[PDB]
């Protein structure tokens, strides 16, 4: 219940949405009582690699504004040696909170949300970005439309959406994002994530890598949706469907 100034404009704090490590997200109001969301980043103890992660994200978020309206709007930012203030658009709820709350999920709504996600992820891919950590939390609902809020660039954690090739990478391509998007859609379809059954985290990782671990796809009145899920959840990235291929899929094109 204080106020902040961003590029000579005063914003009164309505409420705090999020709290990260060195960051805070607020629902704020301008002089004309218009709502915005302000991301505040305290830089006081951030390292060179951390500052560069924050600078890269702001540059990408600022460039990608113009390429899609499925990417969160960034009106303005203030960047000093001490802080970051990002003036952005306000959404009603994130997809994770929305999915946890929603008992039933309408096929028309699911399909529209899938399309929204494919467009956002496709845009970041066209600019050489692979998010690599997609989960419902990265999507905000803003006037019935899902928007991507994060690019995976800046640095509870859920191993439930991790691609099999990301686990193998110990001794990551656009296909990695296809696996994660497929998990979100599997959740929106069957009410759960593919490897949510495995309560233990150690064995959950073995399951994603195990080719003989059959993922269940119970029959749906939407057979097109069933193929999307079977194509996204292919353990071999080489055999996994691509985003340009998903945009031409009958599930997205045929109503």
Ligand X SMILES: CN1CCN(c2ccc(C(=O)Nc3cc(-c4ccncc4)c[nH]c3=O)cc2)CC1
Nearest-angstrom CA–CA distance, 15 and 153:
26
Tell whether residue 18 is among the known ligand binding residues. yes
Stretch that binds ligand X, among 77-85, 86-94, 121-129, 243-251 (CB under 6 A): 86-94
What DSSP string describes 192-241?
S-TT-S--SHHHHHHHHH-TTSPPP----S-HHHHHHHHHHT-SSTTTSP
Tell whether residue 3 is among the known ligand binding residues. no
Asked if 39 touches ligand X (CB under 6 A), the answer is: yes
Cβ proximity of 188 and 228 under 8 Å: no
Task: Report how far apart, in Å, the C-alpha atoms of 156 and of each of 19, 159, 252 are.
Answer: 12, 10, 32
Asked if 88 touches ligand X (CB under 6 A), the answer is: yes
Tell whether residue 22 is among the known ligand binding residues. yes
Q: Which residues contact 49 (CB under 8 A, 6 or more apart)?
A: none
Nearest to 241 by CA among 233, 251, 231: 231
Least separation in angstroms between residue 16's CB and ligand X is 10
Asked if 153 touches ligand X (CB under 6 A), the answer is: no
Identify the residue among 54, 60, 87, 94 touching ligand X (CB under 6 A).
Answer: 94
> For the range 157-160, what are the long-range contacts, defined as Cβ-Cβ under 8 Å and sequence gap of 24 or more?
159/201, 159/204, 159/205, 160/135, 160/193, 160/194, 160/195, 160/196, 160/204
Cβ proximity of 41 and 22 under 8 Å: yes
Least separation in angstroms between residue 124's CB and ligand X is 14
Tell whether residue 41 is among the known ligand binding residues. no
Q: Which two tokens stand for residue 123?
A: 């845009």
Least separation in angstroms between residue 45's CB and ligand X is 20
Tell whether residue 87 is among the known ligand binding residues. no
- Our CB check for ligand X shows the closer of 40 and 161 to be 40
Q: Which residues contact 202 (CB under 8 A, 6 or more apart)?
A: none
The site that binds ligand X (CB under 6 A) totals a number of residues, namely: 16
Stretch that binds ligand X, among 91-99, 159-167, 171-179, 216-224 (CB under 6 A): 91-99
Asked if 150 touches ligand X (CB under 6 A), the answer is: yes
Query: C-alpha angle 164/131/121, rounded to 5°?
Result: 105
Interface map 107-146 toward ligand X (x if CB under 6 A): ---------------------------------x------
Least separation in angstroms between residue 161's CB and ligand X is 18
Tell whether residue 228 is among the known ligand binding residues. no
As annotated, the active-site residues are: 133
Which residues belong to the annotated binding site for ATP? 17-25, 39
Question: What residues are designated binding site?
Answer: 17-25, 39
Site for ligand X, rule CB under 6 A? 17-18, 25, 37, 39, 72, 88-91, 93-94, 97, 140, 149-150
């Amino acid at each position: 219940f204080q106020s902040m100034s961003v590029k000579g404009r005063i914003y009164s704090i309505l409420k705090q949405i999020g709290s990260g490590g060195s960051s805070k997200v607020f629902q704020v109001l301008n002089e004309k009582k218009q709502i915005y969301a302000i991301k505040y980043v305290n830089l006081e103890e951030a390292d060179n690699q951390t500052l560069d992660s924050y600078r890269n994200e702001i540059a990408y978020l600022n460039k990608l504004q113009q390429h899609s309206d499925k990417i969160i709007r960034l009106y303005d930012y203030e960047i000093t040696d001490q802080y970051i203030y990002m003036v952005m658009e306000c959404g009603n709820i994130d997809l994770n909170s929305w999915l946890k709350k929603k008992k039933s999920i309408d096929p028309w709504e699911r399909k529209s949300y899938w399309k929204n996600m494919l467009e956002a992820v496709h845009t970041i891919h066209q600019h050489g970005i692979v998010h690599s950590d997609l989960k419902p939390a990265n999507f905000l609902i803003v006037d019935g439309m899902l928007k991507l809020i994060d690019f995976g660039i800046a640095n509870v954690g859920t191993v439930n959406y991790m691609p099999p090739e990301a686990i193998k990478d110990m001794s990551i391509s656009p296909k990695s994002d296809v696996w994660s998007l497929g998990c979100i859609l599997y959740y929106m379809t069957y009410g759960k994530t593919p490897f949510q059954q495995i309560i233990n985290q150690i064995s959950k990782l073995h399951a994603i890598i195990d080719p003989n671990h059959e993922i269940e796809f119970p029959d749906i009145p939407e057979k097109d949706l069933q193929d999307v899920l079977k194509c996204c959840l292919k353990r071999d990235p080489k055999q996994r469907i691509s985003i340009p291929e998903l945009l031409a899929h009958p599930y997205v094109q045929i109503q």
